[PDB]
Amino acid sequence: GFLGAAGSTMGAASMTLTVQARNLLSGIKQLQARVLAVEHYLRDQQLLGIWGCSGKLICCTNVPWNSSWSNRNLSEIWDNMTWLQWDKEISNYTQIIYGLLEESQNQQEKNEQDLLALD
Amino acid sequence: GFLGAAGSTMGAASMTLTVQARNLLSGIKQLQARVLAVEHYLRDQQLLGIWGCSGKLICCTNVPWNSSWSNRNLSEIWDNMTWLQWDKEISNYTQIIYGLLEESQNQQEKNEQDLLALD
């Protein structure tokens, strides 16, 4: 069910990502609302593309966790917390994380380009 | 800065691709303008997808450079030229290059399909 896992812990909630992914896309004011929904969808897909995550729902990266953003144990984050509480905790550092992800992908793409240059 | 590298050489300018990529997407006439901007964005993303470059900003291919399109040295193109001068030089051959890229990706996808068929 759409958002059925919203109150579920992060671990169990991560198993239903396709339900929300499918639901996100599925007068002049209504047409504006539809265009805005499309623009928001594309902004999220573009952002995933910038990070090298264009085809994945669960995308692993090379950016280390600082631990200052959140110093909780991994089992506490995934087994005891919900995604809403986690977002409330990380929203102060979300732009920092996004900037690091963009820089990491730019470095990875340059490194792959150089490896491909070697004959 | 958005287009800050426009007057910079191709080499240095290639390091800021995410700035323009993010800026490209970020009454009835205004709604038409927004829909057109979305359609143009999607046309570029579709074209990258056709070439097998859907998730990359710097995408390496298997199409050789003919040298008739431009016979400049690699250091001249990347260290002395800007992207605007380069586009002015290649616009006469851009459709040829795009056609070759599409054909190359179709051949690559068929070859991968056949390699995957081998058990």
């Epitope: 490194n111 380009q113 490896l115 004959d119 | -």
Partner: antibody, heavy 123, light 106 residues
């Protein structure tokens, strides 16, 4: 036209470690890949390691792949090599050299364009 | 390693060739075989880069060539000032980057 000077120690015990460092002058350090090449006292010279111009990519010869770390600092214009488990087979004069690779947008090299004079490391 | 003669000699003014023999994956497939001139007690200097090119500052006496899987350095106009240990260096690939031969004493 350019200067490249090796700094390093001498005799070490087997099983230890030693950091070598080279300083560059006369060319843009960040524009060229750097390598280490070594020559045993009685043998010819052989390639040891290669680092790209940015420093993100490193490559090693198999005989040292699990011990040596190659690193560069483009703000200091220096190249460092941290060696561990110096074996008797690793005794050699270690030269820094400019060349060996190019970052895709530059003309190819696959040669060592400039050389230093060499640090002598013994075991 | 690459195969080189342990010693080559000739009279002053003679054209002297130093062979470098490798396998199909070293000299044959990749046309990136360089030559270095090492004087005793000194670091090697680059004489030839690519199969046929000379760095600026190196005279035209040093002429490189390649045939099949064998590379060669021809030194015309032999003089005592150019006596040194010569080495060939070939690009082997992405898994193995460079292979050097033994020194040739001239």
């Amino acid at each position: 036209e350019v200067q490249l000077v090796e700094t390093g120690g001498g005799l070490v015990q087997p099983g230890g470690s030693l950091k070598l460092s080279c300083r560059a002058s006369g060319y843009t350090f960040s524009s060229f890949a750097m390598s280490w090449v070594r020559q045993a006292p009685g043998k010819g010279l052989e390639w040891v390691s290669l680092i790209n111009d940015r420093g993100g990519l490193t490559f090693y010869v198999d005989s040292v792949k699990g011990r040596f770390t190659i690193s560069r600092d483009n703000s200091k214009n220096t190249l460092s090599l941290q060696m561990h488990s110096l074996r008797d087979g690793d005794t050699a004069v270690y030269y820094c050299a400019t060349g060996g690779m190019s970052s895709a947008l530059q003309s190819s090299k696959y040669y060592f364009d400039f050389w230093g004079q060499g640090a002598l490391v013994t075991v | 390693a690459l195969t080189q003669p342990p010693s080559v000699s000739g009279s002053p003014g003679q054209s002297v060739t130093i062979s470098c023999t490798g396998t199909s994956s070293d000299i044959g497939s990749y046309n990136y075989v360089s030559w270095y001139q090492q004087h005793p007690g000194k670091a090697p200097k680059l004489m030839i880069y690519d199969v046929t090119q000379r760095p600026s500052g190196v005279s035209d006496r040093f002429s490189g060539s390649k045939s099949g899987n064998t590379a060669s350095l021809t030194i015309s106009g032999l003089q005592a000032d150019d006596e040194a240990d010569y080495y060939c260096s070939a690009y082997a690939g992405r898994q193995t980057f460079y292979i050097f031969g033994g020194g040739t004493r001239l």
